[PDB]
Amino acid sequence: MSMSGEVAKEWQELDDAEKVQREPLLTLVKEIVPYNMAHNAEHEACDLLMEIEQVDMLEKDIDENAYAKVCLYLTSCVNYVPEPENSALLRCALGVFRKFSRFPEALRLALMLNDMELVEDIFTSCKDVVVQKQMAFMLGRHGVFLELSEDVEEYEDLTEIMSNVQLNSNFLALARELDIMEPKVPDDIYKTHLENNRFGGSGSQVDSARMNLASSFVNGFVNAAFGQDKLLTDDGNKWLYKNKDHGMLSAAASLGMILLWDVDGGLTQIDKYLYSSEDYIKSGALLACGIVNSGVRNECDPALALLSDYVLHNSNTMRLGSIFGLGLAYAGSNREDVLTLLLPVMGDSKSSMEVAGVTALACGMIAVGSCNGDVTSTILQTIMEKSETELKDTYARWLPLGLGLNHLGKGEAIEAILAALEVVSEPFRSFANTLVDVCAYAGSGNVLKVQQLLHICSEHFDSKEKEEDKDKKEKKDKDKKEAPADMGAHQGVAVLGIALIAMGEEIGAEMALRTFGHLLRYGEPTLRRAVPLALALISVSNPRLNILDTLSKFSHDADPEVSYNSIFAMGMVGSGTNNARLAAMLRQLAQYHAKDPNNLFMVRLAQGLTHLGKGTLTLCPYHSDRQLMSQVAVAGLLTVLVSFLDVRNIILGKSHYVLYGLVAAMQPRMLVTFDEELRPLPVSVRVGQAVDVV
């Protein structure tokens, strides 16, 4: 019209086409082009506000985007009746995509505020009420795909439109960096459960059909996988050759080949150190000496015979680390020893864990992928023989570690048979017992299990176990973000919050320093004692900066309880890498005059922070650690704990044969460490030797 080409700048040329609409339709863009093309003219981009409506109703595309570059506003609300809107929008949907990638094969757009913002602004009304399946599927743009989805449960989002491997490589890569901040990640194939045949088959189809370059993610996948669950479900999903792929499965030759490679990257001293300690006969500690020979040998039977014959003396809990080496020796590859491993169980009423519960733990933990399936039914049948003598307390801690480890989705339920013994009613012993007892049975994930076990146990309620009971629901759902919503209670016992922040948040970036720092300053006294315990999870990213900083003030504190949780906070997550600050800090720590095991628990556990399963041949020399443990053992003089510490640094020191690292790069979590490490907090007598299994 003539008003659009006026020299005056007076408003407005917007929305004026709604008043008189059908009449201006008689004209065409031929009147509009001389005003916008000629320079030194008024209403250049202002005339596009009326033109964006004419090009939209005429289905012309790439013109509406070019005219909306300056506008950026009227594109949202534009003329209401939805039928003309959703009609031309699908014409605009399919019509803009054909204007892109016409070369063909990119060049890509060219998130830009023109193309990506216009499809995002219109996507509002798209995700509001009508239609479905906007240009994000048609154009295949991964940039708009991040803005395509809306807040929803991601469990059903694991499926996508199938395409070529070329585009799927970039699709899964850019969808991964979107899901690293999201609770669910592509790595969830481990955790989930699921358990359907979909992920097992699709996991083996990414390397299909090439069996040569498949060496990665297949050959290195089966050998580094300790559990049979990944080697069972994927066995039916692996079609290569026929029936003979089991040689690289079951962890028979798998664990044997990587163990020989650990010897090539090893090794650990055998004759020198052990036979020299044999002239010292048996130390008065009866604590860390058994687990030594466990990981070391592996496989040799002569060292296994000294274990057995000795521990028939039955003295105290010393049998723990020993019989744990009975199975682990032959089980280093496969199967193994699972026949005579469970024989001492019924051969030794327990009446406690330190007597017959040792060998009963052996078959459970040393299993590592069994099931198979005889070991499952064997462990359940073996524990049903001993009930009143176990009873509900001491051996009920380790028994769930023989099932939930291998299979989180196992159909066999061992909880109901054990839960009938809770009639002992003891609130004290049940603390460290029922904590990991109900939690380590299975990973669950159906939300129905935690509701069941809450009604049958409580009944009522235990007034104590209900603390640790709700933490299982926090452990059940992994980093689902429901945990920050579950901490609003914040009971005076405070055990809820500390276990909630650690396990309830798993992500690459911490982001928890705002909440973790708030609970310690706003929390009641004595809570700061258990605050560092959350450092075993969220600190796996950059433990160097944040950990030793705050723990430096907590290490010199005179309170023995907080100093016991300080060195533990660093602990394993802080022992991954060495440094000169860690070695220089070791000075003056062992020079303290303080008594009690907290003194040597601070210094000696930090001696294992110099490396994990590395050396000594190749690489770090053992003479440096030998002179350190010898000079510190000359004090007191015994103080038998000086014989505990010098054998403590060689627990993980001389074991080797396992590189962890992390464990693990696949992002699982060790269920034996988080279990046992919570007992040393109210440490009394034998709760420290249960942790010595590691």
Added chain:
Amino acid sequence: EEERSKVDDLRGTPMSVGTLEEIIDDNHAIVSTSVGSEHYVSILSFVDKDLLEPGCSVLLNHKVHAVIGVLMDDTDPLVTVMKVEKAPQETYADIGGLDNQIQEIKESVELPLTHPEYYEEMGIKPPKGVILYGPPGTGKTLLAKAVANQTSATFLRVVGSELIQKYLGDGPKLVRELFRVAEEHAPSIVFIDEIDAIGTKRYDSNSGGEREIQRTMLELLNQLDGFDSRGDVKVIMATNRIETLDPALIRPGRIDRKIEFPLPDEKTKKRIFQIHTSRMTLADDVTLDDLIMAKDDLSGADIKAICTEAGLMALRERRMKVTNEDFKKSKENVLYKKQEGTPEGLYL
């Protein structure tokens, strides 16, 4: 909570703000308040006496001349100048064309901080910073790494200039400028630029002249020499031409790396302008083949100036247009500007 309503009667409500003089081992702390008054103050409260140090703003209670505690000190007009950050608004996407120079010193500025393992095993270490020089922007050439060092740790820019900064000299309060900014973070980068000492028109006010400008530079050495400083405070010096530093001054630093950037070539100038215009061009359409071919030669300084006036003269048309008779006439002004001093020489 209760300590707020308890000690308030023990100190206040009224009190005074004095200064600290000296401390005696008998717990009597001599303080001095305006004007010319001393006293013996023995207080066990809230101290913290070790962190104080004299010259402090420490309070003095009215009854009777006792120090209950401290609040804070701002202090002086001197701190309000810089106000951090500086944040990386000078971007590596504003520079380009230099390769052999950009590789070497990138290590020295990144040699501290990351990769500490082989840095501490050395134990000698080069914690001297670096040194820059050269016209017009040869010192500004690697300044882009100093702003690239603003993405982590901390940066400081101190204008050396010539006259306005005088003082005793004694350099008393400029060491304060370096010290107060390092107290916030304590990594540091300290940058000095444009030393005019050789190009002075005259001495400023009562300083010297001649040797007293030299002795405050010799004090600039003794500060920087220096006894005794361990950490950083990473020292970076820059100027147009350095005849200044004595053979003694270069030995502490910078004895490792000092830089020289040669005049740009056709590859650098094209990479200078195209990268400078990567954010913003003029009327798009810009081709760099005829730009470096027409004017031969001169630094990439003025190539932005002729483009500054390019869209500026076209702004008489309020956005976009080019007049062939006017553009080459407006280009004649800068073309002759460099064509007045064309020969040297034969600089060769």
